[PDB]
A paper describes a structure:
We applied this processing cascade to [name] ([name]), a serine hydrolase that is crucial for the metabolism of neuroprotective endocannabinoid 2-arachidonoylglycerol (2-AG). [name] represents a target for the development of selective inhibitors aimed at treating central nervous system (CNS) disorders associated with neuroinflammation. For [name], an intracellular target, the cellular permeability of inhibitors is a crucial factor for successful drug development.
Residue numbers in the entry: 6 to 295
């Protein structure tokens, strides 16, 4: 009997990739009609999935880039216990596998990364693992420093799991209403059956603590060009992390745009913010693929 997604769809009916642990990852592709100018991988964040990026991917494909993505392990239509990961580097390893596979099918093309929130930390660590190989990185509120209160409060819960055997202990779920001012986008996110609504298991949040620690160590070695978009009112990825990334990365091509008053999910924010986000990513990628 065929391997099926967590939603019961046979993987034989869907674009897919099997990772190093034998787990099926659901894949998405948006390819132009002409010859692509570059490849770009879209890295989604915790609890969500690659389908959230449909509009942004179609914009990028309109610039004649070949856009590709997968649902990370434990997310969306990929396999794995929901919101569990043996080690955060699994996400990075799996991105590199997909990138490597695509560079075979479309050799000679520059490859970019785009990531949001946890997906932005994945993008950072992916670039850091292959210095000099990626053409650029677009970061939308990447997880660099967590909100100090959410980091401390959770690090307490972590000390419990780290010292005892408590496999089901979890934090409370994050309130999606504090992550975008656009109420319609909040309602859409809360209506998507592929989104994981439960609170973070402490074991997973420990891996997000690991992500931040590894990002910190990676910064003074990071050289990839990047565009960094950050809201000033981000309740999840503290804006101080965006400033620290601008200060500590060694990249010769780094740009920060701050959206004053905007919340965490900038590509799902008020229309004036989201329209600007799309425009600025368009300009940045266009200038680096011309
Ligand atoms: O990746 C994360 C994310 C999640 C939970 C985390 N907990 C920590 C954490 C904990 C302790 C210590 N250090 C870090 O880091 C996190 C990162 N994301 C991206 C996808 N998200 C999203 N939210 C929306 C809300 C409204 C409307 C649209 C959307 C939308 O499209 N996506 C939610 C946030």
């Amino acid at each position: 009997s065929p391997r099926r997604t967590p939603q019961s769809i046979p993987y034989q009916d869907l674009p897919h990739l099997v990772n190093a642990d034998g787990q099926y990852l659901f894949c998405r592709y948006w390819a132009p009609t002409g010859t692509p100018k570059a490849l770009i991988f879209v890295s989604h964040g915790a609890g969500e999935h690659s389908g959230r990026y449909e509009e942004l991917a179609r914009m990028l494909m309109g610039l004649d880039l070949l856009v590709f993505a997968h649902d990370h392990v434990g997310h969306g239509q990929s396999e794995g216990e929901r919101m569990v990961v043996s080690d955060f580097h699994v996400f990075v390893r799996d991105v590199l596998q997909h990138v490597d596979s695509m560079q075979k099918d479309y050799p000679g093309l520059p490859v970019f990364l785009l990531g949001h929130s946890m997906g932005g930390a994945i993008a950072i660590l992916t670039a850091a693992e292959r210095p000099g190989h990626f053409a650029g990185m677009v970061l939308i509120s990447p997880l660099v420093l967590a909100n100090p209160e959410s980091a401390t409060t959770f690090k307490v819960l972590a000390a419990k799991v780290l010292n005892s055997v408590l496999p089901n202990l979890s934090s409370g779920p994050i309130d999606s209403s504090v992550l975008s001012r656009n109420k319609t986008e909040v309602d859409i996110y809360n209506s998507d059956p592929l989104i994981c609504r439960a609170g973070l298991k402490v074991c997973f949040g420990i891996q997000l603590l690991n992500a931040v620690s590894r990002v910190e160590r990676a910064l003074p070695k990071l050289t990839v060009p990047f565009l960094l978009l950050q809201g000033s009112a981000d309740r999840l990825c503290d804006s101080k992390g965006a400033y620290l990334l601008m200060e500590l990365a060694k990249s010769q091509d780094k740009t920060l745009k701050i959206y004053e008053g905007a919340y965490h999910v900038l590509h799902k924010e008020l229309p004036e913010v989201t329209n600007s986000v799309f425009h600025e990513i368009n300009m940045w990628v266009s200038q680096r693929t011309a």
